[PDB]
């Protein structure tokens, strides 16, 4: 049993830093003043950070958190698609027409 | 059988033993929470060193080697580990920051092992790790682990061989200066290792690194005794200028105010046309840590010096009076070699101009004028006499000089001409080089070659006229 | 002390099992990331959001624009 | 302790002031004998580690300069004390089965004290070429018992015959060498295949992440060269997870350092005895430290064998050492005809250089520097011991009193000649 404990301790501590895998690091900044980005200060959004941190919680189960991740993902896709579809068509048409009228 | 210690102090003697230890050591540097588990690691290492009867000396060495292998970004945990282990001199800790104690205290066994490992530069494998090992020793040599002189007195190049190399360099330089050498252009083109050693390792390299890592008092105390050492290599002057420039920068910004003008160092945003609309984005860079002291930005990423608290022991100036008081220590050491770093000339001269302008109205202006006269006479002008085709620095020094009575300017110029060109070696070398070059150009002035000879003569006369 | 070790086997055992659980969770966490990264790739490579509205897109995007979409598989890169 | 300090303080009053030495040490020995159990010994040692600098002066009544000792192995003070403490060390080593961690801590404290007392150079402070037997890492005859069985047998055979005694496996009859070679080859093959799988997993993860993060931004153009591990973002900035991990490490550490569990094995033992545990240890693909230990062992022993075969100068020293302790031996020490020499110096340069370094020169270029530095340092230490550790005989401890320097803080004066020179 002691041998098992020692080997598993090495496996665990090996698995945090070295064998780790992290996010994709898609970057977008709102502030206009900033022009140079460190590319390492990028953090995930609080909504994602809480959902992730609930994994290593003492009493939580994995399946429910996986479901919550699925729901978050679907919400993100839906909101992004809705905003893009709204922004493209009507805004482009109105901007073009108003620009032409203003030039005339 | 009766009086031997029965311990195994060569790696192949107790293989299993050292195996475990060194493997464990790697673990400590690959552990995210390694910082809060120092005590567990020390207890593990003691348990192991007990089981298979490893030695204390060899095990200290094994720790030092595979630690120096990770020193860059491991130094925090490394120093905490050694700080809590009982191989740390706790009742006689060395100081290394007080002239009266540069040779008292430390852990002399670590001193033996270090002074040993620093003199092995004969094989080919250690020539690529000497840098990291010297950096680890330079880190240890300022937290009081070992006193300085215990390391200085015992590294390879003895003081006598150093002095001999110094005399050889002095004579060769003086001869090549006074006599000079004819550079063959078309001459005869038709008819009808120990120097590298002294320069690259041992005492000189230790001095350069002790200077880079912000420990100025050992090297000040050494160069106070043997000034000629500055002839061995140029890099000492550059690094001393680095620490002095960091010392002076915050005083310099408080005057000649550039802080209000600091808010213009920004980069252009990457602009791109997508779907027929403009879109701006910021540029993305990443940060790397290296052993080279000067920062840079190589086309996508920025490099920085790793040991980011090297400037902990130094306090910048608060008033020009402190600038005088510390000039008398650092600049009197750097000597006539200040010219190797032009930017310092510009900074000090602009500080002078602003200090003289600040009290144009007051009655005591002549006091400050006299004091800056003396300063420029003793510290700056000999330096500017050394420059090489660099007009703007001389333009700055003269922009400061403009405030004096012309009698004083003639005094300084004539003294520099008569008494300080001779009787000082590097100044003499530079004057002789400039003079020979001026005559060489003067022999080749024509109505047809003026288009470029005029520019060259203008640069040469503007840089080092008198 | 070497004779009686049946009485000290439980506690260690406990820790062992506890450690195992921790690893599990951490492993799970990594697996989780390996899905979301993948989904993000989905958004980059062209458009694949061929989702069904079911009166939801009318609620979110707007009833007025819903006409032009009635007459999604839209890019979201 | 108060009496032991009193005898130090009352030295000047004694009739023969030097005679305090043999007195002081004497008392010390007695009390070292009376301590009940290693618990009490560890509770008492910080004293003897506080007042070391009092031991180093054998007879002089004035303190010694820090770093110089005037004790010798055969002098009147140590003549019996070193013999006695070596007896105690030997007895503590002889247990080997019923050793609580307290015992190993005690033996370490003692060996470090004695090694610090005598200088590095004394004739009895560096061993004279005794290659340590009894290196086994088994579970002390507890829990001691397909592919697992053959792997265990092969590892046991090569470990014993090559690493337990490099000397013998250096002077063989050309049957022994080829035997250990035919036993070794597949072992290294399998272990290196496993390490390849390991680094392949790492590189696949990093490459996929980098390709995505590059194709997801405007002008990123990631740097594929660097691969040093870094803590993930969603952990480098959290605080709940860090507190939880610290609570767990504290719980485990409290389990460890408790008087109920002082009979454990070290954190890196391999236990050649229990076959299935050995198999689970070496071939796991997630815990690679055991393979690093094995590679390090092979590299050390092969370094020694190569130097032995080729140098023909250390061979004389080892022959002399083997002879002096036992004038009757059987190893050739001269018979290196060339058919043997060839096979040996070939197997060495094969495993130590052709495979190991060639492997860890492309992948993990930090273990590379580690093994190279350790091998070179071991060679240097061997050749330094050969001459009798004369390189540490000269050290030049400075004894001056350094005064604070004086800085000229005055400026020169100006002559009567207002202008430059008399004429103007």
Residue numbers in the entry:
A (entry chain C): 106 to 209
B (entry chain A): 165 to 356, 394 to 667
C (entry chain D): 99 to 169, 191 to 196
D (entry chain B): 97 to 241, 250 to 528
What is written in the article reporting this PDB entry?
The yeast THO complex is recruited to active genes and interacts with the RNA-dependent ATPase Sub2 to facilitate the formation of mature export-competent messenger ribonucleoprotein particles and to prevent the co-transcriptional formation of RNA:DNA-hybrid-containing structures. Among them is the transcription-export (TREX) complex, an evolutionary conserved complex containing a multi-protein assembly (transcription-dependent hyperrecombination complex THO), an RNA helicase (Sub2 in yeast/UAP56 in human), and an hnRNP-like protein (Yra1 in yeast/Ref/Aly in human). Yeast Sub2 is a conserved RNA-dependent ATPase of the DEAD-box family, a group of enzymes known to destabilize and unwind RNA duplexes.
Focusing on the classification of the entire dataset on the rigid protomer, we improved the density map to 3.4 Å resolution, allowing us to build the atomic model of the pentameric THO protomer de novo. The final model includes the large N-terminal structured regions of the five THO-complex subunits as well as a prominent low-complexity sequence of Hpr1 (residue 501–675). The densities for Sub2 were modeled using the RecA domains from the reported high-resolution crystal structure. In each THO protomer, the proteins Tho2 and Hpr1 together create the platform of the complex. The platform is about 200 Å in length, with an oval ‘head’ and with an extended ‘body’ formed almost exclusively by alpha-helices. Module-3 provides the Tex1-binding platform: the curved surface of the Tex1 β-propeller (blades 4 and 5) binds the concave side of the MIF4G-like fold (at Tho2 HEAT 6 and 7) with conserved interactions. The Sub2-binding platform in the ‘body’ of the complex is formed by module-4 and module-5.
